[PDB]
Each structure stands twice: as C-alpha cells, then as structure tokens.
C-alpha cells in the first residue's frame, strides 16, 4: 500500500479510461 500502491492503482485506471476517451473522441 502506501501512496506508492495508491499512485500505481490510480494511474492504472487513469490510462484505462484515457484511451477509452481518445478513441470515443
């Protein structure tokens, strides 16, 4: 955990939807 696993699990979704937008946009 810690802010480390928090920035890895959060950044993981950031990209997941990131490409989802550029594609639908």
Q: Look at the chain and count its residues.
A: 25
Sign of CA dihedral 11, 12, 13, 17: positive
Structure tokens at 3: 């802010």
The CA-based dihedral angle spanning residues 7, 17, 19, 13, taken in that order and rounded to the nearest 10 degrees: 20
Question: For residues 8 and 15, what is the distance between their CA atoms, to the nearest angstrom?
Answer: 11
Alpha helices in 1-25 (DSSP H): 2-24
Question: For residues 25 and 9, what is the distance between their CA atoms, to the nearest angstrom?
Answer: 25
SS3 content of the chain, % helix, strand, coil (to 5): 90, 0, 10
Experimental method: NMR
């Amino acid at each position: 955990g810690s802010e480390k696993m928090s920035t890895a699990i959060s950044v993981l979704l950031a990209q997941a939807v990131f490409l989802l937008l550029t594609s639908q946009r």
